[PDB]
Amino acid sequence: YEHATTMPSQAGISYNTIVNRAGYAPLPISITPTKIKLIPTVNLEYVTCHY
C-alpha cells in the first residue's frame, strides 16, 4: 500500500501519523530525524599557505 506524507525537516523533533482503511485497524507510523546532513559535491582547486 502506497502512502505519502510530508515530514518537516527539523532535527530532534518527532513526527507521527496513522494509516487506516475501512476494514483495517490503525497502523501507527513514527519518524524522528536525529541529524539531517547537507553534503555538497566538492572538488579541490588548490591549497595556499604562507610563503
Binding site: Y1, R21, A22, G23, Y24
Partner: protein, 100 residues
C-alpha cells in the same frame, strides 16, 4: 457491524447482542443473497453477545440476520478491500446494488 470489509472472503464482522430465554446453541442465517455467513450456528449464554462472520456484496449493506426463532435487521456502511487480486473464488452472491 463492528467491522466490514467488502471482500471475497468473510471480511465482515457483526456482533449480535442477545437476551436468550435459556442458554445453549442455535443456528444463524441470512434469508437473502446480500450476505453469506461463515458459521452455521452459535452458542448463547442468557443475555450477552455473539460474533457472526460473513462476506458481502453491497457497499451499503443491510440484511435480515435470522437467528434462533427471531431475526434482527443488521445495517451499516462497508469499506473496500486491500488487494486487487486474491487467490480464491468468491464466497458472496453478487448483486446489482452497489450504490452510494
Amino acid at each position: 457491524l463492528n467491522e466490514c470489509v467488502y471482500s471475497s472472503d468473510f471480511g465482515g464482522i457483526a456482533t449480535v447482542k442477545y437476551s436468550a430465554s435459556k442458554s445453549g446453541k442455535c443456528a444463524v442465517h441470512v434469508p437473502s443473497g446480500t450476505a453469506t455467513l461463515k458459521e452455521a450456528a452459535v452458542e448463547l449464554t442468557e443475555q450477552g453477545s455473539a460474533t457472526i462472520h460473513f462476506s458481502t456484496a453491497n457497499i451499503h449493506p443491510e440484511f435480515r440476520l435470522q437467528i434462533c426463532t427471531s431475526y434482527v435487521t443488521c445495517k451499516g456502511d462497508c469499506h473496500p478491500p486491500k488487494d486487487h487480486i486474491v487467490t480464491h473464488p468468491q464466497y458472496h452472491a453478487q448483486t446489482f446494488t452497489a450504490a452510494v
